[PDB]
Amino acid sequence: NSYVALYKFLPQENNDLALQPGDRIMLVDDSNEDWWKGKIGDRVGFFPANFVQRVRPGENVWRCCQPFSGNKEQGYMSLKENQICVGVGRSKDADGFIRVSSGKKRGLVPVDALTEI
């Protein structure tokens, strides 16, 4: 049931849940395709389904600290500053990169383009 927020979300309705990038969220209800219910702290409410990503046990959450332009055809994923990424720290490679997922995309990014939330 564990997710992370990818983007800022300001509540529109009383029943909404405010999100900040990097927030850990417990999923409560994904029965609607557009609006999911979840919990952060003691707050519960709705947010856009596409604003979150799964985080598995033993996965790290990072934010991009400098932009990276990546060649997608070779398996590199471009990053914008403040973009949220999920991966496993010890999977970093011999060449200064690491594979991470961000939203629906995945690829190699520089280790030095990432920092802890």
Swiss-Prot record:
Residue intervals of the SH3 domain: 2-57, 60-117
Location relative to the cell: Cytoplasm, Cytosol; Cell membrane; Cell membrane, Sarcolemma
Reported effect, W35S: Loss of interaction with CACNA1S
Superkingdom per UniProt: Eukaryota
Consequence the record notes for mutating Q53I: No effect on the structure of the two SH3 domains
Entry function: Plays a redundant role in promoting the expression of calcium channel CACNA1S at the cell membrane, and thereby contributes to increased channel activity. Slows down the inactivation rate of the calcium channel CACNA1C.
Assembly and oligomerization: Interacts (via SH3 domains) with CACNA1S. Interacts (via SH3 domains) with CACNA1C. Has much lower affinity for CACNA1C than for CACNA1S.
Protein name: SH3 and cysteine-rich domain-containing protein 2
Gene that encodes it: STAC2
Section covered of the full-length record: 296 to 411 of 411
